[PDB]
Design a protein around this ligand. Structure first.
Ligand SMILES: CC1=C(CCc2nnn[nH]2)c2cc(F)ccc2/C1=C\c1ccc(C(C)C)cc1
Ligand SMILES: CC1=C(CCc2nnn[nH]2)c2cc(F)ccc2/C1=C\c1ccc(C(C)C)cc1
Lengths: 209, 196, 196, 209
């Protein structure tokens, strides 16, 4: 149900604890979104955990990448923190930042990917049948197939002048995959929201006696 | 000697790859530097896609293009069991179960080759345009060979994220060295130590 | 909850680390930005050095700073047995065998902290100068405390390459996540999924 | 023993095959050097192989780093090939290359590390008792200890005005270790000697029918 996926999408100083709380909040947002995706909650809870663990990075990146179409040559996080290249280059994650801009954000803008298409792609990512430890990979594959079947129908209806649009959307996923991998190994997300609170906390303690 | 054999095999494989790309429609029409960049960016995934599909008739193993067979027990022995299992489960077994044919493999490899995200491309838009012509043709193919499988085309495209990450994990784990280079290097070094 | 405990423990460890550095001679005299760079560049090796030395009275395991004990059986379960064994064999057991004392550990940690190769340092030469004063002090210590062991000072310094690569490998294998974060995250996610 | 360590130091298109032969030559130079190191050849042959496998990268880097003391912002190879920073940045290995320059070449230059000192440091690297699979780790440690004992005596004799020189040499090894690791994971060596022959072979074949 493409209508159901679109409604899912729409709906002091102790630095490490503060960062974890932000991660907590963002993770919960993802869980709530997944629950609104049709049939996800019908999967075993152990399978739901595995899918979220396998997908959380790509799912987060896809979100703030699409959110950043409106913003100006930077990345808009959910927290409202507008991060520019130099903040990313200062954090030691400039390379990833450029790829996110080039391979995802810019491309989404150029093709004007909408929230329904974004939602479907993330549902496809969520329904990842290659996730290790699944009790029943086949039903996960089945749910993913229902999603892109629905996405394709949506594209041919809303954009009949673009017959290659559906495949174009799908072929952003390899970039999302590779960028996802780089983010986990550089602690991209936790560096971006964490560098300032840590440096600030550091400065205060070093200046104090 | 095993080391020279591997290096020769690489050269032959590289020759075969370059000849293959030149027979892909409109590849040679791209600027030469762009042709090089694409081949530079793609050789790993192109190679993995090739031996994965080649290994469909193999049980619990892979076939490298010169009758070189590697079993998973050996793969786990060499410390790359995890990435090896990923090749088996995410690529080989999926290719087997849906019976991906050589025409389908060819199109998917052409899509991999026509990678507009490759850094340094002078005309990324032209590369993207050629990719679109490739997957349009692949969709047309799937529709007529398997009309009863409307999701087949998308299902093919959705192996590419797996190929991408497997390719990356392979390089980071020295996949090929640990599987085919490890023992020849011991032999190599022993021979050097045998020198006067 | 298991997760909050870890972040709270992390904050405390970070607090302890900063205070330790501030009591290192001439550390607070460095420019503030350089102090931050040094603490950022060094915290991993500094922390690893600490719990390694703490774990000398433990067999086949490590003691993390809040009574948190991890045995090698658990580490292999979590998929980080190799790096864990390196910590055991290259650091802990070596610290045990030469009976490295806390003064020697302190100096080595001070040397790690005063890292002149740290990128972005405003005055690398002053950092190097402070490092030299530290290892001059450590040599004097080794000479007079253990005169019958003339190679001891060098033996201490030559654990630093092992510390360096282990620090790098720990981060690349998500060592700490896999040992103390993995299971709490499953519990965490389950709690979220069972929520209204 | 230090005199022998100094004497050890003193003494048409198939691109991959051509790269392998170059690697072959360079590796053998290292093996021949190790054989002249006292007591090395007395170790079991399986242990010698293990030590060379564990050390070959660091041993090579130390060599061309020290050789590059005379040159400006580049690396001088055994083949006589002068590789510059920007040529390395073009190959996608700019970050490591600079680290080699800053943390090794420059440091070797500033303290005027001599070939005896280089030779001793490489012997220390070679005699790595942490190498996995050694039949007798203790005798390797024993050999390493004999080396740095000899190196220290050499430093205090030749440079009595520099009492911290010996420790200064030893404390380049953590940097050598970390740079060594980065080189294995970026295919540093095989990119440096390999990028040009491959691009050439590609261009000529793509130009051909
Ligand atoms: C890239 C690469 C390394 C460099 C290190 C590496 N990177 N990723 N995996 N290994 C290596 C090292 C070796 F020893 C042997 C092979 C290789 C190799 C590639 C390769 C793959 C398959 C084949 C078959 C056609 C025979 C030949 C060469
Ligand atoms: C850096 C880090 C990650 C980030 C990922 C990582 N990097 N390297 N290893 N893991 C992580 C994730 C977790 F889940 C749990 C811990 C950690 C962690 C470090 C750490 C170590 C000890 C303690 C106290 C017990 C003293 C707290 C935090």
């Amino acid at each position: 149900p493409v209508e159901r996926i679109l409604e899912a999408e729409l709906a002091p100083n102790d630095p490490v604890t503060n960062i974890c709380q932000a991660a907590d909040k963002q993770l919960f947002t993802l869980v709530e979104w997944a629950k609104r995706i049709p049939h996800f909650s019908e999967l075993p809870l152990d399978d739901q955990v595995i899918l979220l663990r396998a997908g959380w990075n790509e799912l987060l990146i896809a979100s703030f990448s699409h959110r950043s179409i409106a913003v100006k040559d930077g990345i808009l996080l959910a927290t409202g923190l507008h991060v520019h290249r130099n903040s990313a280059h200062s954090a030691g994650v400039g390379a990833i930042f450029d790829r996110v801009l080039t391979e995802l954000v810019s491309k989404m803008r150029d093709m004007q990917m909408d929230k329904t298409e974004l939602g479907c792609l993330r549902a496809i990512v969520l329904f990842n049948p290659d996730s290790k430890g699944l009790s029943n990979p086949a039903e996960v594959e089945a749910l993913r197939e229902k999603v892109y079947a629905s996405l394709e129908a949506y594209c041919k209806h809303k954009y009949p002048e673009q017959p290659g649009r559906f495949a174009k959307l799908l072929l952003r996923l390899p970039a999302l995959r590779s960028i996802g991998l780089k983010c986990l190994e550089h602690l991209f997300f936790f560096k971006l929201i964490g560098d300032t609170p840590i440096d600030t906390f550091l400065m205060e303690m070093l200046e104090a006696p």
